[model samples]
Target: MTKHIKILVIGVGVAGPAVAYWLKRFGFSPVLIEKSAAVRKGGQALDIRGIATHIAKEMGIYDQICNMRTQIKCGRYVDVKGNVLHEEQGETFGFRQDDEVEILRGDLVEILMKAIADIPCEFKQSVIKIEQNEDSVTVTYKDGRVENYDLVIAADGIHSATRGMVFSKNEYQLINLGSYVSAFTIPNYLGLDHMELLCESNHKLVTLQSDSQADKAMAGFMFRSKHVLEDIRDEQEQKHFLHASFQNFGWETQNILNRMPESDDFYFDAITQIKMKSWTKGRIALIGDAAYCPSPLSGQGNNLAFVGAYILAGELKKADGDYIQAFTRYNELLHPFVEANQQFGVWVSESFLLKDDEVSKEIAEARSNKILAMIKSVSNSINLPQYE
Candidate 1:
């Protein structure tokens, strides 16, 4: 015997919970599963802009998000000697307009999780293999349990196991955006309040901010590195690599790196974009970063996740359980918007970093203006679809 649902969502991150919320509202049975023991916490800030703001309002969590938004008031770019070269209001610095909100990725995910609390979710369970037939897909769990569903949606992430298992490497392209980003939280050693300090030299940049808890601060490091780590996902190696890359650099680099080993929330990754030929094949589909990660550089990753979830679930309702039509529409309608955001991400990654011998005040201002303009233009590229 086989059990069937309109949708089975894997990886209860931003996309899974979001799609589950809409799926249930649209009168569909959607089951969510997570491989993690519980909800993972502590990621960098993510912006909710453009069409995603509309979706958030529809979900009735916009106000909550606004209340918990990161309220950094100033962003200062400084030289190696800690002299402020440029300053911008945080709103302008974040490139947010009107209803755009900046919230911690973990907080936003928590909000989405709360919204779907009524839905059944199995945590600490993972799919080992998936076998699909015409009418349904059979998924074998790591615990030796097998279940079948009408459709499976993979919202796993950029390095999605489902994607690797089901789709061929040629079906997707992981474009390296010529940089690396690492962020972690440390004690508020600088005692900065509601202000972010940034220092740049050579092609490297470091930003530190006192946000959220008053006693804690977040540090972010970005640099141009053509050297790829053999194991990009290895935490110890990532820490060592960051230390080596920013070792000789000045302006709190040593202090932050000294605390790196003790930091609990360290996150490091090569800035990369996910490009796929199609978001769906057979009864399986992809959403959020799994299908199209615009990368964190675009500052629209959460927005894309929100909008993608809304459209994906809405398309299913519009199809009236006809998944093939829904999947096709999802891929076609989202491709243009996805491409625009990804390109914006690549552009930002390239333009934001200072290059060798390019630290003049004039060059810095020009680069800043260019980035602000790009952020403004790309943040609202898509007009959201209305399901009601």
Candidate 2:
């Protein structure tokens, strides 16, 4: 009977496809739409740890994820002069333990997409307007097509356009952590083999890593900034600002910046957390980063997405299509877990990328030890409910 509940999911990132899989599993007909022309590829690494590992196993994607997981054998903290200050195994450096795995974000998305292959997914599709009544929701696409559905689930990312269109400014609070993150791919100039090298100084951190693909290297930059840009979305300006920030920092930084522009998969964003009093309003609901992004700093965004998608869809099935009941349970059940992860994110932002202090061996060792235990604890902090 639940098959008639017409549901629309936006964004083909981790959350949208994940929720679609669960919705179909629960006997709901969900259609997915993505703004991009096709499945987005080449994003930074994402971790599947804590309860998320269990969820992945339950979904039968755990083995698949393991097959594609990154094999970063060693992570080194280097001084500005290129001396290795400290080193740890990749799992410890990544704040992962037990069955946790790390994979490129795009790889995970592809697996999730494959999981819901029977479901209708439209690419190069955009929603221009969304109007909701008491009983149903109406979506208007950029093609000037109008459609109505029993419910709409938005899984768009932190800077979700769907969220802006539906929820008013007062409905949510965006907490910027005074930091910006950028990552892209370049040639393996250092000839790194399954290794990651990091340098941190003066509130700026840069990393160069080569894993799986020996010829390609991934460069990451994170910095604390007080100055706000005129337009944070401009790639040229972002690259210029990043170059200026790291130009003075030594040890392979200049080399990385020199090749940044030529790299095709550049990504830049401020580390910000989204806080909402409620993820649902009327017939529409928000999931994943669109609803409650803990920011990349937490290392829990992917975990949260998997857990949220499963719970939201499971609740809908439990409620037999009563969205009000499903939404309420979803919020109540997921809030405590979300709070813990967000607090962890804020703590990490405060503790990492020290001001004026180099990442010494003692500091790096202490952080690695503490993070290993803490991330394991926080990632498994949620007790998942079983839905038959």
Candidate 3:
């Protein structure tokens, strides 16, 4: 007699829908909600490989994801003089193997949401407060409505609002990786065709390319920042900061900055990881970036989320819908996997970006080879448990 648990899943991003899909498959009912009005179809490209790729296959969306992959034909690395130092084919560029792929974040989120088509999902809805007791958790929505559920799962991003509302400040820490990253869209002025161009300076690197969407180009920035702003939330200030930081760099950076003010989808954030002592207390639990964001540098965010959701839902099923038991197993089984990836994130963050002379084709080649090996190590750290 499997209990039909009602779980409130917050955030419609990668983790929320993934959990909803798995929970429903495991005979639980999950309602999904998001702070945004609709699916946010932005952010940097993502890779689905190793266990994550396997999870996608289990979900029956592997073919669909591959059909929508970025499929960038080539990636060119250039110097400040716009001279190509080296170039590589698509797979080598992303360091993907076999069925591994690089796809836009929004596209993957859309697919995950689609997989949970039968689940109750709300847009532009958020929880204002959460109160958990022995049997259930009560939630107050932003619209002054109230509801209760058997359990609450916060799959929100690293700066999770629900986590702050439920847990004390000391429960979680934002570990900064001494860097900042930004990405946005610009006109495909360079007429790039299914390809990417990269330019790197002493401490900062910018990439521009057009793929899938030919008329538009995506620009990415990763740099070691010494400039601490008075207001990190001010968009105007952020744009100014980016321009100021990369104004003198060569390649298409100046042109991208010139169009930065016009881009409505500009995203900027400190490359930070979330570290939590525990992801659950009483009737509530956290999953994905909300609980243990290994940072974007890890390149395993989606993989961890997929594996975490799978284990969480599986453990719940195994425990016969006992959340306390499930949460314990979730923490125990997933912590080492999470730790390995977070360590990988920190390692890449510290050494990925270069000083003056460390920027070169040889340097990039070594880094690329080393990163691939580390990714394989971390992604396969946990042999996924079969929960049937």
Candidate 4:
């Protein structure tokens, strides 16, 4: 009943590999595919918190994650003039508590892929078209190959093309938080030693940090902006927008901008959240950021991926291959958790960024405390069902 099931898992990011792991454990045959030539590298840090930690332990990758976890020792908030306004040590600064671990996104994906080494994962593969029938779905790949699978689980992330092809616009909504974020690597000019420094002013924020790679620093920029880029995918346009937005904002912004051109891994995107009434339709299903992303503000993407993967695959095993039953349970069981985190994302977007002034120590301290309390509460909002 399991080995014969030809399930297609799209994208090699957090959700794809994770769902593949669970599906394989349940004795199903899952084929993982990635659009990129190889596993992507150099992404921002992600946190595995709350009940998701239990899921990781169940997957037996928790120890590996901890082994490669980032070790930022301190985080500081500074004014435009670069004077420290607030400071926090380790976990507190990262709004992490208890056993919650933070690891670079690339590291976590690498570890997840390793855990599912037996599964067949194809690179430079992507779906150009898909058609779902009552029992199976037919997929057309970019390479002119056509194949059919019992089910197709799409984990292609926020701009998931699979989601676009299958679900109509009425089925989902992309909520723009009226802000843009960018990040890249540069020389560790400040010689930071596991330190994160953030400077905020006039609704824009700049962060520079050096972590495990001592000689390299990651520079980040976030701000409320209504200016639309002609083409959001154009890197040069993104760099120009960054320069225009932060050239005179002060506090090393100029230095970071000067080095932005040479940086190999520049990333920029509008902070947007995805909302959907259902993540499954017929023989195709969506998971992770492709289904519901609470945006980066909530910091719950990784946790959601882990929990969603475990529940989706576990429900399939419990249902004994009745996908309709499993899909319904998947929707019913995860809705409340997803709703809570999306709400938290909206709240954080409104509350964290300042309007007309720099962040003060009082405000920073208060926000940190509230985030600590709220993130912990939301992260564990659901109870995972044990399936063995």
Candidate 5:
């Protein structure tokens, strides 16, 4: 074996690639592993803002991201009968003004992965078992292989198995904000061109956005769900629940539900944020959503991932192999930012959906004004540290 990788990064998602890229940039040879067989394609749109934009530029991928950015031109709020209630130009409707841009999740991740092409990466690999001490971590892989690393970083996402195994239940909090969301890819039968249509009623909302993809569109559902599920991770159970919940909804909601089973990608989850008092347990450190997810409602998942990876690797570089010192600063310096985003997420969860009220032109525009101001403020609520 070539045996040069000293740091192990789990999860090839946005955080995984981001951290791996920075670690390599900062003179650490980190190898990346993903549980999935390959890069996930077709996901919800993600925004990059604030210090993340700087990080992207530093990594030389900003231009690439802008190139592959979602080309949505307009957004329309429609009634249950599909009548237009309000309309917004795409740029203002996306929340972030100035230079900030949104891109499909998969496209952004792919760009990040390519930026670190020199780093070694493995697919269909994950840490099945791990034992970490003050000096190193011994990890046993799902493929029945064992490896040792000076440090292990888990970017395995919000529902991280690494966090569950390395830390106790009481050690972290999965704060639910009383909402559920689902997104899937569907056929663009409506012939939407770089546009989005939204319909809302009875506390549930259905939206379809078509950007860049001529033949495909994205369907999204958000609502306050009171029903409890025994297993939120089960696909069949989740699909059944979604069908039942949206059965009475109108304006293409049922049609979208009909396409759920055939969709190659269907994401369903309760809106949640991860709260941890500390992010490091000896040589095992959690990064990105694994450590602190502001939740999808926050609209800052990509930004957090980008900023966290930069700070984590930078601190490690500053510490000069002293993992404890590095981990401490990473925890301390990133905490305030994480808290702000989580709070923003909670606020969005509480207010983003209309319960008994329909989305009228007045209500929609007012909401848009509020969100744009908030996004501009919250997404730039951090001061970045220079590691160079």
Candidate 6:
């Protein structure tokens, strides 16, 4: 017997769950699977603004997200002596305005999972291989389970295993943005009270903040690097590299590193964007960062994920599960918006980091304006489709 669904969604991150919810709402049977044993948690704060805000309202999660939003009271740029060089109110500092909201990545995922609890989701599972015909796709999971579906959607993220398994190398390009960012949590040793402190010099920057939680703080570090590690996934090697790179640096650098091993929320990754000519092949399609990542530097990753999921699922519904038509419409509708955001990301990456003798204020002001402009333009770039 050939089992079939309207859609099969892989990797239940932000994009997958959102897609599943919309698919179900559109009267489609959407089954989802995740590689993690449970919903993966913890990371930086992500914003849902502009068109994404409208989507959230449509999904009835906008108010909930706003209620659970982060409340950083202050943000400061400081010098080595800890004297505040510049300061902005947290809301504006975070670039949040109007209907825009910011929440921790983990918190947002939890909210999304809760919203889709009734959806079928298999945990600790992944797609191992796939075979497709003109009408459907047959996927083999790691545990030897075989399933056939009318459409398969991959939302597996920037370094998507599904993309590598199905698409040729020429189909996608991994664009490195020449920087690395690391984030983790530690005890609020600085006694920061609902405030974030930042220190930057040369090409390095550090940001620390007491989140809504009073007892803990999130620490973030960013620096320019040209060094390439042979094994990017090697945890020990990554730790060694981070330690070597930030060692001897001032302003609580030593303290954060000393607490690194004890911290359970450590995350490190290169600033990268995925460029693809098309987001679909046969009955297999990619969504969110798997197809087009705008990189985190753009501060638009979450927005892209939400908008991409909405559009992809909406396209499928509009086409009534006609894979060819749906896939074509998906790519055509998203490409220009994707390009706008990616260009915005590239601009942000280059302008945010200062050179050896560059002035900090000039760089910061210019980058801020550029980001604000890009955010406004891309958020309104595409007209969302109505599924009804």
- lDDT (CA) for every model shown? 0.85, 0.91, 0.86, 0.91, 0.86, 0.83
- Encode model 2's per-residue lDDT on 1-388: one tens digit a residue: 7999999999999999999999999899999999998876757789998889888998889999999998999999999888999988998788887899999888999999988889999999989999988887989999999999999999989989888998899999999999999998999998999999999886888999999889999999998888788899988889888998888988899899889978998989899999998999888899999999999889899989999999999999999999999999999999999989999999989887666666789988998888888888998888899997
Over 169-198, each residue of candidate 6 has an lDDT whose tens digit, in order, gives 889999999988898899998889989988
Runs with alpha carbons beyond 4 Å of true place in candidate 4: none
User: Candidate 6: what lDDT?
Assistant: 0.83
True-structure lDDT of candidate 5: 0.86
Q: What TM-score does candidate 2 get on C-alpha atoms?
A: 0.98
Compute each candidate's TM-score over C-alphas.
0.95, 0.98, 0.97, 0.97, 0.95, 0.94
Instruction: Please give, for residues 337-379, the per-residue lDDT of candidate 5 as tens digits.
Output: 8899889889988787776666789999999999888877877
TM-score of 1: 0.95
Global CA lDDT computed for model 3: 0.86
How do the residues 1-388 of candidate 3 rate in per-residue lDDT, one tens digit apiece? 4546778999998888998899999888889999898887746688887888888999988888888788799998888788887788987788787778877888989889888899999998999988977887999999899999999999998889888988897988889888888999888888999998888877888999888888899899988887787898887788888888998887778788888877777899888888888988888899999999988778888888899899999999999888889999999999999999899999977777776474678877787778888787778889899986
Looking at model 3, residue 226 earns an lDDT score of 72
Q: Write the per-residue lDDT of candidate 4 for residues 344-384, one digit (tens) a residue.
A: 98897787877765579999999889999999999988977
Off by over 4 Å in 2: none
Which one wins by TM-score: 2 or 3?
Answer: 2
Pairwise TM-score winner, candidates 2 and 6: 2
Clashes of 2: 0
